[PDB]
Design a protein. Structure first.
Lengths: 779, 98, 49
């Protein structure tokens, strides 16, 4: 088989355990300078980024924080053992442990540093873990940036573990198997107090794919149908085919010379179509997939066994084209020649079915109130355990409905046929005879069919939505007769090993289905929120359907991907992926601003402005705000491209502050400042009307990287024309960057909770239905 | 002198009524109709009504290309019934819509 | 158009009563009907033909 392989091998999940710390910043030491630009004799550690791939354009940066958002979601731990990452502290009074191989690499580089102060090295010797052995809690020292610690504090406190005992394993199976007195379970282990698990996501359908997604719902009802056929139990101890055809031919008295409509009654009575009709009627009602019906109207035995099929099963399971065509031939052949009426003379497209304009014409009480039962027979939608199940009638699951049936068939055998020959009366009341000989074996078959339907829908975790299927599985009618004539004695019930296995393939698909929805609603919300207006979201919802393994995406058109979008956008983001984004969106400014090879704006003022002094550069044209200047958005300029207001301000030399992420260069010499060089780079905008080429110039004038630095003994303080828009890095306080991390010491994680339960069953002679009587109690 | 149209075709807003009206009758139980041919025609309308966002934008583009290219017209757009006729096939329209 | 005729042929069934059953579908071309209808509608309205 092809696709049940694609439905069986859906693995449950994978429980991630974190092995690192997720840091973004890390310390670097670099030269420091005096007030005048002269070099000191020391250094200083500063926070720098681990790796720098901040792009140039403004739009190209906001879609870099969407990459950073999906990078964190692929690293969120479900659980977190803290004693697995801890390594040595080399300089402790008691030889303690530190949480990371990198945090230990920071301590060993500051302690043997020479410029480190005294009490910093004394603070390093005191960093040591502790263990609270009775409360299952440990604590380790750590060194993390305040943004980095915000991601690690969230990963500690919000994790998916929950304690396990024996009692949760009892309550993992559905209730209606714990209720059933045909099933006995035990277990052999006593789980410890440090055993954990992860409960699956079993929220119901939030997309409601059965409304307008008709080609998608049709694939789902197919996969639930083919899964259910391999779970319905195989029939045992049928009556032998030779011993039945030989008896069935004695009641017909088949002659060799007279040509009869009786030899048609011996068609398709094998045992292979016996358990074909048994599997189709149950699996179509578990997956809610419409049946289709056909026959040959010469065979009158198909019409007799079609009366019983329309009794026990509600008529919303068949298409109208095959139902109405089948039940018209029951009425014109059997019922209407009995009371001497004419033919039906039925219109195609009648608002009423042929059983509905028959209950108002027939004057027999016993026939017509069976005709009224078949008319108004349907399901009942009851939410059993949070899951919309669809329950049959109580007279059907009793099997009492066969008694209302056979009262009508005994009337038709009593009726003379006035307008018909004696051969025609003799031929109809044999097909009644062949069915009335097996009165007790129909009440048994109805009670057996309904118990296998009750038990197998205890393991369905999705709503049984009753929508008529597009493609409608086919059902023979000569295989219904082959079920009635050879059903026998043996009661068969689903084994608990199959019953525990049909439940797990429904949970593994449903929890897969919910986790994928929560994946795509995070990305589609975060892309409409970080202002990504040139992004086409076909590929987000295309990967949504690749990983739901059932569908074929290559034959899904483009509309259903952009219609699935507009329905999946209204769903709220769940709590764990939303709280990650509020740490991304909050510190979105700090991460972009703390990098080199990018600058966030240029000030062009035509005054002589003084160079700011810093400790790590000496002298800079760094401007930390845009105050008193006009702003020109470079990204809106790149989008439209009018270049009329920027040609005006650059020809008439008015003061301008251009705003946008920009790569720069670093120039360290004074003669390149004395020659007024920074004002040169802006005439290229007038010549070619593009601003992606634009690359401003950042001066640093120290004593070291300056080639000479001598001119700065003339008591001259340096002065430039243009500035940049950038911020100055943060120092590394070793004491304030220390944090302490809380977690559990030991636990164990179990999956597949049904591996611990062993379940036998009662012997099948002594199986008990709902009314405390037996299934198939006949001798 | 030039020939122009409404606002509701210049944006795709009139297609929001063609949706409702076509969708409305996609539930008409169709009395006297055979249910075989009834379900084939009620589903063939939802081939089109489920494409609302792609036809609102298609008539949004068709009106713009007509609007931009008629700036370069010099003679009058005189309207009168032409003796012969350029022929349209509705197979080409179903191929444009889907 | 290979995934577009596929959805259209299965959303409406083609065994019902009809006599064409393949002569219904001549919309499979895209650069020769959808292209040659988009050119027809605008050029007929600019020329008032």
């Amino acid at each position: 088989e092809s696709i049940l392989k694609k439905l069986e091998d859906i693995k449950p999940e994978q429980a991630k355990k974190q092995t690192k710390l997720f840091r973004i910043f890390e310390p670097k030491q670099l030269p420091i300078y005096r007030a005048n630009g002269e070099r000191e004799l020391r250094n200083r550690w500063y926070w720098k980024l681990k790796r720098d791939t901040l792009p140039d354009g403004d739009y190209d940066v906001r879609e870099y924080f969407l990459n950073l958002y999906d990078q964190v979601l692929m690293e969120m731990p479900d659980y977190l053992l803290l004693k697995d990452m801890a390594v040595e502290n080399k300089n402790s009074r008691d030889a303690g442990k530190v949480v990371d191989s990198e945090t230990a690499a920071i301590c060993d580089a500051i302690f043997q540093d020479e410029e480190t102060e005294g009490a910093v090295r004394r603070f390093i010797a005191e960093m040591r873990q502790r263990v609270q052995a009775d409360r299952n809690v440990v604590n380790y020292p750590s060194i993390l940036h305040p943004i980095d610690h915000a991601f690690n504090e969230y990963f500690l406190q919000h994790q998916l573990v929950e304690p396990l005992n024996n009692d949760i394993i009892f309550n993992y199976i559905p209730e209606r198997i714990r209720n059933d007195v045909n099933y006995i379970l035990n277990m052999d282990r006593n789980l410890p107090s440090t055993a954990r698990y992860i409960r699956p996501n079993l929220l119901q359908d939030r997309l409601n794919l059965h409304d307008n997604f008709e080609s998608l719902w049709d694939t789902i009802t197919t996969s639930n149908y083919i899964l259910a056929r391999s779970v319905v139990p195989d029939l045992k101890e049928l009556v032998s085919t030779e011993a039945q055809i030989q008896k069935m031919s004695q009641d017909l008295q088949l002659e060799a010379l007279t040509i009869q409509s009786e030899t048609q009654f011996l068609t398709g009575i094998n045992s292979q179509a016996a358990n074909d009709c048994f599997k189709t009627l149950i699996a179509a009602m578990l997956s809610q997939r419409t049946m289709s019906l056909d026959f040959v109207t010469t065979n009158y035995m198909s019409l007799i066994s079609g009366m019983w099929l329309l009794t026990v099963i509600p008529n919303d399971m068949f298409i109208r084209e095959s139902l109405v065509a089948c039940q018209l031939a029951i009425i014109n052949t059997i019922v209407y020649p009995a009371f001497g009426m004419q033919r039906m003379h039925y219109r195609n497209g009648d608002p009423q079915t042929p059983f509905q304009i028959a209950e108002q014409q027939i004057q027999n009480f016993q026939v017509a109130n069976w005709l009224h039962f078949v008319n108004y027979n349907q399901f009942r939608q009851v939410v059993i355990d949070g899951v919309l199940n669809q329950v049959l009638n109580d007279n059907i699951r009793n099997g009492h409905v066969v008694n209302q049936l056979m009262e009508a068939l005994m009337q038709l055998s009593r009726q003379q046929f006035p307008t018909m020959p004696v051969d025609y009366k003799r031929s109809i009341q044999r097909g009644i005879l062949l069915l009335s000989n097996r009165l007790g074996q129909l009440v048994d078959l109805t009670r057996l069919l309904s118990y296998n339907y009750e038990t197998l829908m205890a393991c369905i975790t999705m709503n049984m939505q009753h929508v008529q299927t597009l493609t409608t599985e086919k059902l023979q009618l000569t295989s219904v007769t082959s079920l009635c004539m050879l059903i026998g004695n043996a009661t068969v019930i689903p084994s608990p090993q199959t019953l525990f296995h049909y439940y797990n393939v429904n949970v593994n698909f449903h929890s897969n289905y919910n986790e994928r929805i929560n994946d795509a609603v995070a990305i589609i919300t975060a892309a409409n929120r970080l202002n990504l207006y040139q992004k086409k979201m076909k590929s987000i919802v295309e990967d949504f359907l690749k990983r739901l393994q059932i569908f074929d995406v290559a034959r899904v058109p483009d509309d259903q991907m952009y219609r699935l979008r507009d329905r999946l956008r209204l769903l709220p983001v769940e709590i764990r992926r939303l709280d990650i984004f509020n740490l991304i969106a909050m510190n979105m400014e700090q991460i972009e601003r703390a990098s080199d090879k990018i600058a966030q704006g240029v000030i062009i003022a035509y005054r002589d402005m003084q160079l700011e002094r810093d400790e790590m550069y000496g002298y800079v044209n760094i401007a930390r705000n845009l105050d008193g200047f006009q702003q020109i958005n470079l990204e809106e300029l790149m989008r439209s491209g009018d270049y009329a207001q920027i040609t005006n301000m650059l020809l008439n030399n008015q003061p301008v502050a251009l705003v946008g992420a920009l790569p720069f260069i670093t120039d360290s010499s004074v003669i390149s400042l004395i020659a007024k060089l920074d004002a040169t780079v802006f005439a290229q905008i007038v010549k070619l009307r593009k601003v992606d080429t634009l690359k401003p110039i950042l001066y640093k004038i120290n004593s070291d990287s300056n080639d000479f630095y001598l001119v700065a003994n003339y008591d001259w303080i340096p002065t430039s024309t243009t500035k940049v828009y950038k911020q100055v890095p943060q120092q590394f306080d070793f004491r304030a960057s220390m944090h302490m991390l809380t977690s559990n010491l030991t636990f164990t994680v179990y999956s597949d909770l049904l591996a611990f339960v062993s379940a036998d069953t009662v012997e099948p002679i002594n199986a008990v239905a709902f009314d405390n009587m037996r299934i198939m109690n006949e001798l």
